[PDB]
Design an enzyme around this catalytic site. Structure first.
Site, PDB file in Angstrom:
ATOM      1  N   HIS A  28      44.928  36.243  38.215  1.00 55.85           N
ATOM      2  CA  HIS A  28      44.475  37.251  39.312  1.00 55.85           C
ATOM      3  C   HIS A  28      44.313  38.583  37.912  1.00 55.85           C
ATOM      4  CE1 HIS A  28      42.514  39.356  42.232  1.00 55.85           C
ATOM      5  NE2 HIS A  28      43.150  40.022  42.365  1.00 55.85           N
TER       6      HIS A  28
ATOM      7  N   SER B 249      38.781  42.509  42.233  1.00 61.65           N
ATOM      8  CA  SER B 249      39.781  42.452  43.583  1.00 61.65           C
ATOM      9  C   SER B 249      39.438  43.440  45.058  1.00 61.65           C
ATOM     10  CB  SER B 249      41.377  42.896  43.084  1.00 61.65           C
ATOM     11  OG  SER B 249      42.138  42.177  43.733  1.00 61.65           O
TER      12      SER B 249
ATOM     13  N   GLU C  94      44.525  32.258  40.330  1.00 57.60           N
ATOM     14  CA  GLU C  94      44.165  33.276  40.686  1.00 57.60           C
ATOM     15  C   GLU C  94      45.998  33.706  41.105  1.00 57.60           C
ATOM     16  OE1 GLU C  94      42.463  36.087  40.799  1.00 57.60           O
ATOM     17  OE2 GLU C  94      40.348  34.871  40.078  1.00 57.60           O
TER      18      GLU C  94
END
Length: 566
Positions: free
Chosen positions: A467, A214, A347
């Site tokens: 994610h 990230s 995600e």
């Protein structure tokens, strides 16, 4: 986050504190650093592996007083032995569960972990840079435990860096020496420390791999782009992000005044007087008010965070980003180190709770004009060409008669992760000489082993690989539990850490010694490839055409008549 989950989390925090006591041995050890000796402690894992733990190693002076908003300065050396048997504070931030400000300005520390301080051969050094949108995160082991990596013969290092306005304030006035990117400069100073000190812990300074997820992936990429770090490390892994993602940078130079006014400032908009006020403010006040800084216009334009990495307005000795990252790619030293990139298989599932809170967001899929890249869109987003571009996005993601929340979340996977990765790969091919880049896709779904990000997304009982769900297979955390050796989760831990270690060692992620990977032929991406191949990690390890490719090509098609902007 619900009150019920807040209670469950508090219980887990207490239970974890006592587990960590039971995992602490009575064996301590001294290691050398360029600034003085450090004392660490031998710890156990729930699998009865053991490792030496040094936490709270300073790599910079505490950025307090006149050093607030400044580039990090080298720390003061000490005589005697610094106690590194416990963690330090995290950077000032809003706690992702309790919603209260926590942390300290005194946060410029790194932690070093290894199963053997005097090994027979110098070891790959893996350096993890955490994510959290440049506003949350830490190197605490309740989130980032080294327990899985230390099964193998590596040195693992987890860094902190300044977050939020304290890490990312930026002022145009050269005389004030607040150009921006203090938190990235923290990362640079930590990487320099690692190069200069890892051998004292059994590490090979000629074989350092930086990885992050990230915002930590954007950070790793920044560390591969900037001249400040040229030659400091040897492989990079970008997990669900990079520096050309839309969320990864912002021009925030005018936002310091806005923050100051929210914090009680009564003066005019000039940088000197604004800075003088912000230097006297309490850090908790600045961080608490950050959520109010973005203006109505910026929210309209989908700016996600007020403070973050920025193109610095003037040059300084420590400057990290002198130009936009797309331009930095053109000359970047890190284009020529082995690289691995990847994403999870769903995600955008991360946005589950936001869509539950604001279900009207699905209406943006009616025309999709608000998702067209800003460099292609007219200002009002009403031009026929912009509507045509939006219609292309819509066709890519709206699979039924009426747009759904899942369509929205699929779109999010592309706008924030897959499309920037495609754009980066294609740009990078102009600016490298055959250095390999390998792609993975993390596609293993389980709720038998989780990490705290699932709570933050209110993802209990939600199927799909969101994610940050892969972090569960890299790091121990306080919600984890011991899994059976034969379990699908345990095998995934071994595979994910194994591949990362193999890549860190050799620059090639394939090894026939990783279970289920014997039959894998994992080639790097070529410029001539029209369809990307990746290693898909599910219950099995399989090379596949990237399933997202068709949608990626549909996004790319918006640039057919604007190819210079792609």
């Amino acid at each position: 986050v619900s009150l019920m989950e807040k209670l469950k989390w508090k219980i887990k925090c207490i239970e974890n504190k006592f587990l960590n006591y039971r995992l602490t041995t009575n064996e301590t050890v001294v290691a050398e650093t360029e600034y003085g000796k450090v004392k660490g402690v031998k710890r156990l894992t729930v699998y009865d592996d053991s490792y030496y733990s040094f936490e709270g190693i300073p790599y910079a002076q505490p950025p307090v007083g006149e050093l607030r908003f400044k580039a990090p300065q080298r720390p003061t050396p000490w005589d005697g032995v610094r106690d590194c048997c416990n963690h330090k504070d995290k950077s000032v931030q809003v706690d992702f569960i309790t919603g209260k400000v926590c942390g300290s300005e005194d946060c410029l520390y790194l932690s070093v972990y290894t199963n053997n301080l005097n090994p027979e051969t110098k070891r790959p050094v893996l350096v993890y840079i955490h994510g959290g949108d440049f506003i949350i995160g830490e190197n605490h082991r309740d989130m980032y435990g080294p327990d899985y990596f230390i099964k193998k013969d590596v040195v693992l290092i987890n860094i902190q860096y300044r977050l939020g306005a304290l890490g990312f304030l930026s002022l145009n006035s050269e005389d004030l020496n607040v150009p921006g990117n203090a938190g990235l400069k923290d990362q640079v100073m930590a990487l320099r420390w690692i190069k200069n000190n890892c051998a004292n812990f059994g590490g090979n300074p000629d074989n350092i791999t930086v990885f992050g997820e990230s915002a930590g992936a954007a950070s790793t990429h920044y560390m591969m782009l900037t001249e400040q770090t040229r030659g400091l490390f040897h492989r990079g892994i970008l997990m669900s992000g990079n520096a050309i993602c839309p969320w990864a940078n912002t021009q925030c130079q005018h936002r310091a005044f806005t923050l100051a006014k929210l914090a009680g400032y009564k003066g005019e908009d000039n940088d000197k007087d604004v800075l003088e006020f912000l230097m006297k403010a309490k850090p908790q006040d600045l961080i608490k008010l950050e959520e109010k800084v973005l203006t109505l216009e910026e929210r309209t334009n989908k700016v996600m965070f007020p403070f973050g990495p920025t193109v610095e307005p003037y040059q300084t000795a420590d400057c990290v980003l002198p130009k936009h990252p797309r331009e930095m790619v053109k000359t970047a030293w890190g284009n020529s180190i082995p690289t691995m990139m990847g994403n999870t298989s769903y995600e955008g599932l991360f946005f589950t709770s936001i869509l539950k809170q604001m279900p009207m967001l699905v209406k943006e899929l009616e025309t999709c004009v608000n998702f067209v890249p800003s460099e292609l869109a007219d200002a009002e987003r009403t031009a026929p060409e912009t509507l045509e571009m939006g219609a292309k996005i819509k066709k890519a993601h709206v699979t039924g008669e009426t747009p759904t929340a899942d369509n929205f979340m699929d779109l999010c996977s592309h706008i924030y992760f897959w499309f920037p990765m495609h754009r980066l790969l294609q740009l990078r091919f102009y600016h490298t000489s055959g250095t390999p880049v390998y792609l993975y896709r993390f596609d293993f779904d389980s709720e038998d082993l989780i990490n705290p990000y699932r709570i933050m997304r209110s993802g209990r009982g939600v199927k799909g690989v969101s994610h940050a769900d892969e972090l569960t297979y890299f790091f121990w955390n306080q919600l984890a539990k011991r899994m059976p050796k034969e379990s699908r989760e345990y095998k995934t831990i071994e595979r994910m850490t194994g591949i990362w270690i193999q890549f860190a060692t050799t620059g090639n992620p394939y090894s026939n010694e990783i279970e289920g990977m014997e039959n894998v032929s994992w080639d790097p991406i070529k410029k001539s490839d029209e369809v990307y191949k990746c290693l898909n990690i599910s219950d099995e390890l399989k090379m596949i055409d990237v399933p997202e490719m068709d949608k990626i090509k549909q996004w790319e098609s918006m640039f057919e008549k604007h190819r210079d902007l792609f």
